[PDB]
Amino acid sequence: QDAITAVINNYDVQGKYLDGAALDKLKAYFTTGAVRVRAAAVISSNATTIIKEAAAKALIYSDLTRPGGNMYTTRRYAACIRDMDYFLRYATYAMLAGDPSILDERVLNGLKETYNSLGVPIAATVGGIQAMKEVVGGLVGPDAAKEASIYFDYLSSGL
Amino acid sequence: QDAITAVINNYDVQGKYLDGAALDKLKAYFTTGAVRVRAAAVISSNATTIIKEAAAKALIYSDLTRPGGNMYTTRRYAACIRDMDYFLRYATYAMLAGDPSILDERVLNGLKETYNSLGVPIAATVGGIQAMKEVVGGLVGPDAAKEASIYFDYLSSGLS
Amino acid sequence: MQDAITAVINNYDVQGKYLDGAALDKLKAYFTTGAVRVRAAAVISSNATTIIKEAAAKALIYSDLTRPGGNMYTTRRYAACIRDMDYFLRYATYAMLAGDPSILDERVLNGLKETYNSLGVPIAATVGGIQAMKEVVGGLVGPDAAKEASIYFDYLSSGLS
Amino acid sequence: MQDAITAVINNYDVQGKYLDGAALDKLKAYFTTGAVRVRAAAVISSNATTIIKEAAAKALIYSDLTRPGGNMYTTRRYAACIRDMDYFLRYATYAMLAGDPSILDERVLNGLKETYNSLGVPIAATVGGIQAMKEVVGGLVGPDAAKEASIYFDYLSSGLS
Amino acid sequence: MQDAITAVINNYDVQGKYLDGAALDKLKAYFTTGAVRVRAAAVISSNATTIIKEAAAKALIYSDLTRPGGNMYTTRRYAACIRDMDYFLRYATYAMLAGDPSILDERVLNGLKETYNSLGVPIAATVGGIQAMKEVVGGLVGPDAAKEASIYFDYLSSGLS
Amino acid sequence: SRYFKVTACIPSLKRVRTGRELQNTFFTKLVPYENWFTEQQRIQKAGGKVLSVKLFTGVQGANT
Amino acid sequence: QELGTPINERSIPEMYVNQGVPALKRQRKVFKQSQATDRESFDALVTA
Amino acid sequence: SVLTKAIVNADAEARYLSPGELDRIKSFVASGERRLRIAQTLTEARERIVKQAGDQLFQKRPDVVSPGGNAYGEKMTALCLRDLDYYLRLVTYGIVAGDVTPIEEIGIIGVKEMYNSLQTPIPAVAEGVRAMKNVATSLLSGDDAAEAGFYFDYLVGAMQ
Amino acid sequence: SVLTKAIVNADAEARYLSPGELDRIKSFVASGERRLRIAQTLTEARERIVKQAGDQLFQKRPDVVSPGGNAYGEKMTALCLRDLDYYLRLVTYGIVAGDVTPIEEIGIIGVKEMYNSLQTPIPAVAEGVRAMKNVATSLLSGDDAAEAGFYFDYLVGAMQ
Amino acid sequence: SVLTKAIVNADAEARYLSPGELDRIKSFVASGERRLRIAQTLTEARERIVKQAGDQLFQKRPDVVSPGGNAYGEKMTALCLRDLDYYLRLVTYGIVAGDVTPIEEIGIIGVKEMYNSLQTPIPAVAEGVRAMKNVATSLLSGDDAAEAGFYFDYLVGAMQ
Amino acid sequence: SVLTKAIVNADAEARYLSPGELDRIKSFVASGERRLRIAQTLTEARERIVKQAGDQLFQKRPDVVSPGGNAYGEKMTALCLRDLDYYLRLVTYGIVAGDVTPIEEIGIIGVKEMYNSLQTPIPAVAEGVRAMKNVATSLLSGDDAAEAGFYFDYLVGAMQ
Amino acid sequence: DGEEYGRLYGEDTVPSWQFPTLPAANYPNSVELYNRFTRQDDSLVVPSFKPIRSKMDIASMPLVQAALKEQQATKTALDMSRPMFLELGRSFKGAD
Numbered sequence A: 001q002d003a004i005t006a007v008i009n010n011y012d013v014q015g016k017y018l019d020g021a022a023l024d025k026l027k028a029y030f031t032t033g034a035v036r037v038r039a040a041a042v043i044s045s046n047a048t049t050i051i052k053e054a055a056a057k058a059l060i061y062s063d064l065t066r067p068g069g070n071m072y073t074t075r076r077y078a079a080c081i082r083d084m085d086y087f088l089r090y091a092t093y094a095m096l097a098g099d100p101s102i103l104d105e106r107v108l109n110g111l112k113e114t115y116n117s118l119g120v121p122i123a124a125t126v127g128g129i130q131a132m133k134e135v136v137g138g139l140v141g142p143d144a145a146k147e148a149s150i151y152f153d154y155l156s157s158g159l
Numbered sequence B: 001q002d003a004i005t006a007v008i009n010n011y012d013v014q015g016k017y018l019d020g021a022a023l024d025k026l027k028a029y030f031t032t033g034a035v036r037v038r039a040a041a042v043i044s045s046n047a048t049t050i051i052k053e054a055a056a057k058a059l060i061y062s063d064l065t066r067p068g069g070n071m072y073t074t075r076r077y078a079a080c081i082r083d084m085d086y087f088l089r090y091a092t093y094a095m096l097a098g099d100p101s102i103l104d105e106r107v108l109n110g111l112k113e114t115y116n117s118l119g120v121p122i123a124a125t126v127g128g129i130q131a132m133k134e135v136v137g138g139l140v141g142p143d144a145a146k147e148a149s150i151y152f153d154y155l156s157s158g159l160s
Numbered sequence C, D, E: 001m002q003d004a005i006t007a008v009i010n011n012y013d014v015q016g017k018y019l020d021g022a023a024l025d026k027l028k029a030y031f032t033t034g035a036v037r038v039r040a041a042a043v044i045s046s047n048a049t050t051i052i053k054e055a056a057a058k059a060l061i062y063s064d065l066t067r068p069g070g071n072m073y074t075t076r077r078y079a080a081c082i083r084d085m086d087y088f089l090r091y092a093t094y095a096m097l098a099g100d101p102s103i104l105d106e107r108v109l110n111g112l113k114e115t116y117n118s119l120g121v122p123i124a125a126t127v128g129g130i131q132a133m134k135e136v137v138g139g140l141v142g143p144d145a146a147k148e149a150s151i152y153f154d155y156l157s158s159g160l161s
Numbered sequence F: 001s002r003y004f005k006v007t008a009c010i011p012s013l014k015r016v017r018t019g020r021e022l023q024n025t026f027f028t029k030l031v032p033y034e035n036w037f038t039e040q041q042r043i044q045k046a047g048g049k050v051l052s053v054k055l056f057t058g059v060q061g062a063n064t
Numbered sequence G: 001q002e003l004g005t006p007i008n009e010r011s012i013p014e015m016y017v018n019q020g021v022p023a024l025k026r027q028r029k030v031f032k033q034s035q036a037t038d039r040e041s042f043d044a045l046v047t048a
Numbered sequence H, I, J, K: 001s002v003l004t005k006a007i008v009n010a011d012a013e014a015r016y017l018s019p020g021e022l023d024r025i026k027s028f029v030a031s032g033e034r035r036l037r038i039a040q041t042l043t044e045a046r047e048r049i050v051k052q053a054g055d056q057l058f059q060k061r062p063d064v065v066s067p068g069g070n071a072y073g074e075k076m077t078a079l080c081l082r083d084l085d086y087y088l089r090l091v092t093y094g095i096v097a098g099d100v101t102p103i104e105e106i107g108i109i110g111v112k113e114m115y116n117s118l119q120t121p122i123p124a125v126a127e128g129v130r131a132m133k134n135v136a137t138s139l140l141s142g143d144d145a146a147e148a149g150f151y152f153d154y155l156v157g158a159m160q
Numbered sequence L: 001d002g003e004e005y006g007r008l009y010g011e012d013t014v015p016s017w018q019f020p021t022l023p024a025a026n027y028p029n030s031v032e033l034y035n036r037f038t039r040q041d042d043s044l045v046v047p048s049f050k051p052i053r054s055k056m057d058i059a060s061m062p063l064v065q066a067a068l069k070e071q072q073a074t075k076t077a078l079d080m081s082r083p084m085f086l087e088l089g090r091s092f093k094g095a096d
């Protein structure tokens, strides 16, 4: 869900009509919104490169890519980069939304269990997410980076 | 999968090119192959009888078939003989393949849990498998029997 | 199906022509009408149940059809007839937004006559109902929207005929 | 499907007759031809992409079809047409190995005319393409194979037309 | 058959409505177009033989069709094909005067596909010939007439294909 | 009627998928007794591994 | 310019649209449980 | 036939025949001439094979030719022998084809249902086929017999 | 178009258009007039865009217009330019539609297969589209260029 | 391998292996020894094949080993050669298996995606494999070369 | 031809043909029919072989078809292709003859001198012949290709 | 439970109209099915597939035809590995 809906939901459980204090929180979000939209466009354009750089930092030139490693074979390599893309796309969605919930509902739920059955290494995946965050931070610029970082960290903590 | 593929897979994880020692194992399989094909044809033709004989040896004339036994009622009896057939078919496949893996992937996977929920007795099932092995051994003949026996034993160990 | 914008594009594509001013004018015409159409569609959706009720009252009910031996006799048949009425309304609304009659041809109009003949549903009565819905719709949507709405209703009626 | 060996068997089975020397001779004839057929099939498989390319160049492309509003205009349609061409080639190869035209009737020929008419694909152009493929195939396979190859291609052409 | 004047009348008759101004306007429109149509028709009739000749040269002749084993091979078949071409031209001229495509459906289009399939005449080639005639006709009739002439030719082509 | 609760994981070996497809990979499901046999085989043939099988409804070794 | 124009006029453009596999095949939507993770999505699934 | 089987697998895969598959076709066409001779031998000896097998079957199963039994009476005994003849013809067809498919379509699908309506015992029919195999084997040379045996065994397996 | 997409989703659900869907339609109709101007600009500059892009492409890839290369010769070079013109026309259609769907059906599905039969190199085609984008961007105002860029980028992404 | 394929078809049908299927298995086991020798030859010549192919590739494509190009630099050039070595190892595995499946799982699925992320040009990779084929063909005897060629061709087809 | 060679040796010795020589003649006459087919195949595919080889050559050597280069211009390019066609015709003649002598007299003696006066580069011509060989090999079956290869190789050896 | 359903719809996807190219009459037949409204036509699209006669015999095909001539013509000649005296005594016409 979204920051706006989150405020609404909090009021709805109370049963309270919308109040100025609530409105102020919504207003706060609205100011941040413009920045977020710009950041999202940057990420979308540079998505392929972001993944490439992050992979270079952590995934490739590693035991994983070497034979007997989890990311060995083309099929596994492709799967890992697909997962990386997912994380990036969802983080971008979360940043626009201003809420971490979407990450929980789609990405975070059942991922640990799936990975354990697959035998994918969680710590390495987390490493990759952190690497993406660093690359993203550069492109988006400082103001946007703080907002972007929290969602990346949320994914990492969940995993 | 197969003996040939098993060797390949072991080498692939190592990243090693195929070597003479590996080749020798493959060569060994190729010689055994002809015997295995003959054995498989024998088993397929006599499959119904093999099951009949094995049931006679272990399953029937027993408490299981008597009321209150697991194999009592036509439905349960039919289920048990269906399971016997599968074990035989998969063992035949394994013998041709030269690899125990297919048994793990097909027969062995989820069997124990299913049986425990059903309350089917594992030891009796194992007994039936061993009986089939003995009957099969006769028909296939001695050279083939040794090869056939290992897969039957593998099934039995898995179920237990 | 197609919409007006896509219909222009498709006509040009078969010709292989780049979009030209005459084509642009048709597109421009659509764009102005668009806002009105959206408002009309929302009106229809909200009042759909009533529209059907009023139209049925005007033509279908208190008639031989509803009386025993009539096509709309029995609850099952009555329910079917009002379901069909709803279909016509929904599709006409789709067509009005699209600005193109094609969707009606592709989904509603194709095979309807044959279906009705096998069923023994009376076409003229159905047409009457469609015309009644049009009149009710015209009121709710208002005059500018009504003209646009009417053409799609008439298209359905002509097809069934 | 049916092959020459099975065709002989089936003819005898309907008669109820045991296989006889005359029948055996036909079977023997097939067995000798077999080796040639296998060589031809391998040639066709290796050169399949080129055969299609050449044939398209001869008949399909540089034409109104490829021009906008033509059947083979748009990438999707172009790709479909070359896929169909490949089908014809693969089935003809199967027929040549089999020594029987029946497979063509059972798989390719059955319902093709009707499919094409609904699609609006032009049959005569398709036939033209098949004939073109035949000519190219004849060259590659060589003379002994060519005569055998040609008959299946002609069979397809006659069926479509 | 049906013509524009009769088409308006028939539409009103099914409604049971007396002729109204809107209907009158359509009739009036036809009457103005009439003079142009008559001129076009006279042009076509005078140049009919040449139109056919040119069109055949463009599509039919110097081809596999004319070569032995082709559909238009033998004098009898050649003569038949040019007779068919003449039919299409005459009927198109009738349609243009009438201002209605119905006559084409009633006389030419009905059963043509089936006839051709039984005969083994190639439809796509025939369509090609019709298109060729259209191009020649367009030149002779001149621009105002051309657009009107083209639609009937295209109608024939679409029907056959 | 007896029902089976089955948890099974199936990997997508033939093709990498752009859609998330979490549900297809890992699924817990209720299976009618009659259906389960066939379903178990199908999971095996796919190369999916059935981690857990339980009888959700009914009694084991019941004659009726 | 000439090599991208039609050789023949295409005098009724509608005929040449709607040739081929019908648009229905492409228009339709696919529904999955993976998309279901929302209350509205689920309702669409079920209707489908 | 072997070739039909190969083509069918290719069509399912939607691919041209593999080189390996093509090689198998080549081998089959070479083998065919030998196969034709084997079939010819059985055809010539057909009348005697049926007669001998019939006698063996009736000795093995007195019941079938007993007043209760289905085979009993001249008309019925003739029909039983006709059936044996049919199966032999099918076997010959199989040998030339190199596949059981020709045999299978004509004789093994719906066989259970047909015989159950007739009330003929299926196991007895199987015995008759086994008997025919033994007679046929004796006339055939050893390697020829092995080839013929496979087809005979399939029939016995089918009628089980 | 956006409208078509919305209608199609509604029809699948068998419901009237949702308010959200209606809102998107409203936004699109407002955008359309701006979009029409962008499309008009490119149409007028079409001839020059194609010419300039072609030259750039040929400089980038000498080989394509070389005796070995596909593009070589006047006839072939014209066809290569015709292809570029086709893609430009598709882009204009896209801008007015507000979605890539119109572009996608005509140009991006089966494109690989078509070009592979032709033997045209796909990467070169992509470069040509990139070249056209650069020319088009220069003529367009910045915000207009961004809109146009998206459609151009999609084409480049589709073709690799 | 072939045997695995046969077993899998049987399991899908839930039937014992057909005689024809069994015969194909027999043929494969006989062929295997010849196949092993072909594989052995390539393994011994592996180091030289890779080296020669690399040089040919770099001559064919100066760009790849250029400052812009992916292959440029020692580290990168080594990785490019490592990739060539990987593909050769896969080919050897294929020859012994008698099927492309082993090759396919390790190397051909998701290959496009992997290389696109790396930004390595796929056509250049294909050329390298072609180059390796030519070197390998020269060392192999003609009939052996044809067998090896099929596997090499498949790789080239896959990476296209 | 083989026959001419044998006769010539005999006449030098002033003796009747030796048994060994006669045997070689016998072998040749048996081979001839196969040889004729190989030649026929290449003749039919001649136009395509030349075209494909030309393209390959021009890709391999940009310079020859460049303003400086000899091959450059339509007239010159035609002549270069005509030369390739000539060599192909000679190769076919060789195959039927069973010796390189026919090829040698028409094409390989004085070739250096002729081309040096023309200023055509001899190595480029050799590359074109190599290219033609590759195309020809693909159309020919493996054994046929080997036979054809020998004649092609001779030409390449002759011209350097 | 079958494989087709499993291959294409899987466990989580709702089935949809396939619109298949492939087997042969499948595309036209499916599309007639999809176009019919409920109760519009109850008639079978495919009552059953009618079996097809043979247009051409095995012997008409060129390769077989040739091989028959080769065995038929010059069926009787001279047998190698047969002593000549036995061959000269052999009869060609036989019966008749």
Ligand SMILES: *[C@H](C)[C@H]1/C(=C/c2[nH]c(/C=C3N=C(/C=C4\NC(=O)C(CC)=C4C)C(C)=C\3CCC(=O)O)c(CCC(=O)O)c2C)NC(=O)[C@@H]1C
Pocket: B059, B060, B061, B062, B065, B066, B071, B072, B073, B074, B077
């Ligand atoms: C008598 C009409 C026919 C006949 C009977 C026969 N039965 C057997 C052996 C068994 N019969 C059963 C039957 C049942 N078990 C069940 O649970 C039920 C459902 C309530 C039934 C009906 C079973 C299980 C057996 C196996 C032996 C055992 O019970 O342990 C035989 C012996 C065959 C053998 O080899 O065991 C016979 C002879 N035989 C006829 O031909 C009669 C027409």
Ligand SMILES: *[C@H](C)[C@H]1/C(=C/c2[nH]c(/C=C3N=C(/C=C4\NC(=O)C(CC)=C4C)C(C)=C\3CCC(=O)O)c(CCC(=O)O)c2C)NC(=O)[C@@H]1C
Pocket: B064, B070, B071, B075, B076, B077, B079, B080, B081, B083, B084, B086, B106, B107, B111, B114, B118, B120, B121, B124, B125, B128, F033, F036, F037, F040, F041, F060, F061, F062
């Ligand atoms: C027979 C030797 C013993 C026996 C068997 C028995 N099994 C069942 C029921 C099932 N058994 C299975 C097992 C399998 N399913 C598979 O997919 C495979 C691999 C091919 C196996 C081996 C399953 C799934 C069932 C449940 C449904 C089914 O019929 O398949 C029963 C019936 C028990 C019940 O409560 O209904 C029985 C009796 N039990 C014995 O008494 C023997 C020792």
Ligand SMILES: *[C@H](C)[C@H]1/C(=C/c2[nH]c(/C=C3N=C(/C=C4\NC(=O)C(CC)=C4C)C(C)=C\3CCC(=O)O)c(CCC(=O)O)c2C)NC(=O)[C@@H]1C
Pocket: C060, C061, C062, C063, C066, C067, C072, C073, C074, C075, C078
């Ligand atoms: C009375 C208990 C309650 C009531 C009745 C009521 N009904 C109508 C109108 C109609 N009722 C029917 C119903 C049927 N038609 C059938 O074929 C069957 C099954 C055999 C039924 C039950 C129909 C069709 C009509 C429409 C009129 C017509 O028959 O043509 C009204 C009139 C209201 C209106 O809008 O028409 C009323 C009042 N309503 C109550 O308030 C009572 C509690």
Ligand SMILES: *[C@H](C)[C@H]1/C(=C/c2[nH]c(/C=C3N=C(/C=C4\NC(=O)C(CC)=C4C)C(C)=C\3CCC(=O)O)c(CCC(=O)O)c2C)NC(=O)[C@@H]1C
Pocket: C060, C065, C071, C072, C077, C078, C080, C081, C082, C084, C085, C087, C107, C108, C109, C112, C115, C119, C121, C122, C125, C126, C129, L037, L038, L039
């Ligand atoms: C109402 C004004 C008239 C009327 C209607 C009526 N219709 C049916 C049955 C059907 N109607 C349809 C029609 C459609 N299905 C579609 O997909 C479309 C286009 C979107 C239409 C318009 C169909 C297919 C059926 C048959 C299946 C079904 O009932 O759902 C009936 C029932 C007839 C019967 O014999 O069962 C009726 C009564 N009845 C009238 O008399 C009114 C004039």
Ligand SMILES: *[C@H](C)[C@H]1/C(=C/c2[nH]c(/C=C3N=C(/C=C4\NC(=O)C(CC)=C4C)C(C)=C\3CCC(=O)O)c(CCC(=O)O)c2C)NC(=O)[C@@H]1C
Pocket: D060, D061, D062, D063, D066, D067, D072, D073, D074, D075, D078, I057, I064, I070, I071, I076, I077, I079, I080, I081, I083, I084, I086, I087, I106, I107, I118, I119, I120, I121, I124, I125, I128
């Ligand atoms: C130019 C950048 C590249 C190039 C182009 C090229 N194309 C052809 C031939 C054709 N290309 C098409 C393409 C299309 N048809 C469509 O419907 C669409 C989408 C609307 C496209 C883009 C077609 C159909 C043809 C065939 C000819 C015809 O139209 O009938 C050629 C020449 C063909 C040949 O190989 O002989 C060329 C050169 N070639 C390059 O190398 C450039 C990179």
Ligand SMILES: *[C@H](C)[C@H]1/C(=C/c2[nH]c(/C=C3N=C(/C=C4\NC(=O)C(CC)=C4C)C(C)=C\3CCC(=O)O)c(CCC(=O)O)c2C)NC(=O)[C@@H]1C
Pocket: D060, D065, D071, D072, D076, D077, D078, D080, D081, D082, D084, D085, D087, D107, D108, D109, D112, D115, D119, D121, D122, D125, D126, D129, G019, G020, G021, L020, L021, L022, L023, L024, L025, L027
């Ligand atoms: C190529 C020479 C001509 C051409 C082809 C073309 N085909 C289609 C569409 C279809 N093709 C088939 C045909 C077959 N299905 C079969 O099973 C067989 C026999 C094995 C054949 C030949 C089918 C069923 C279709 C429709 C379904 C589908 O496309 O998946 C098209 C239209 C494709 C489109 O997307 O619109 C075309 C263009 N058209 C030409 O112009 C050539 C003359």
Ligand SMILES: *[C@H](C)[C@H]1/C(=C/c2[nH]c(/C=C3N=C(/C=C4\NC(=O)C(CC)=C4C)C(C)=C\3CCC(=O)O)c(CCC(=O)O)c2C)NC(=O)[C@@H]1C
Pocket: E060, E061, E062, E063, E066, E067, E072, E073, E074, E075, E078
């Ligand atoms: C020569 C004495 C005279 C002459 C001949 C001439 N013919 C054509 C063109 C064609 N003539 C035919 C004729 C036949 N087709 C048939 O099926 C038969 C019977 C078997 C015949 C005789 C055809 C079909 C053509 C059309 C071309 C084609 O084959 O596709 C021409 C040139 C055509 C033109 O006018 O451009 C000529 C010159 N012309 C004379 O003046 C001589 C007296």
Ligand SMILES: *[C@H](C)[C@H]1/C(=C/c2[nH]c(/C=C3N=C(/C=C4\NC(=O)C(CC)=C4C)C(C)=C\3CCC(=O)O)c(CCC(=O)O)c2C)NC(=O)[C@@H]1C
Pocket: A064, A070, A071, A076, A077, A079, A080, A081, A083, A084, A086, A106, A107, A111, A114, A118, A120, A121, A124, A125, A128, F011, F012, F015, F016, F017, F019, F020, F021, F022, F025
């Ligand atoms: C990459 C950073 C690491 C890695 C990844 C990896 N993942 C798989 C397989 C799967 N991963 C997922 C995960 C998701 N599916 C979803 O829907 C979502 C949320 C949107 C996620 C994140 C799934 C379900 C799979 C299964 C296959 C599929 O296509 O769905 C693999 C393949 C492992 C295997 O053997 O199947 C890999 C390699 N592993 C690493 O080594 C990297 C550190």
Ligand SMILES: *[C@H](C)[C@H]1/C(=C/c2[nH]c(/C=C3N=C(/C=C4\NC(=O)C(CC)=C4C)C(C)=C\3CCC(=O)O)c(CCC(=O)O)c2C)NC(=O)[C@@H]1C
Pocket: A056, A060, A061, A062, A065, A066, A071, A072, A073, A074, A077, J064, J069, J070, J071, J072, J076, J077, J079, J080, J081, J083, J084, J086, J106, J107, J114, J118, J120, J121, J124, J125, J128
């Ligand atoms: C050489 C022909 C071309 C080339 C190669 C190249 N590759 C890399 C990096 C990698 N290549 C692979 C490939 C594989 N890993 C596997 O598991 C398999 C299947 C068995 C393959 C084929 C991988 C995964 C990497 C990453 C590094 C690693 O694995 O340790 C590079 C370096 C680029 C980079 O960013 O890493 C290069 C240069 N490049 C060309 O242009 C040549 C045509």
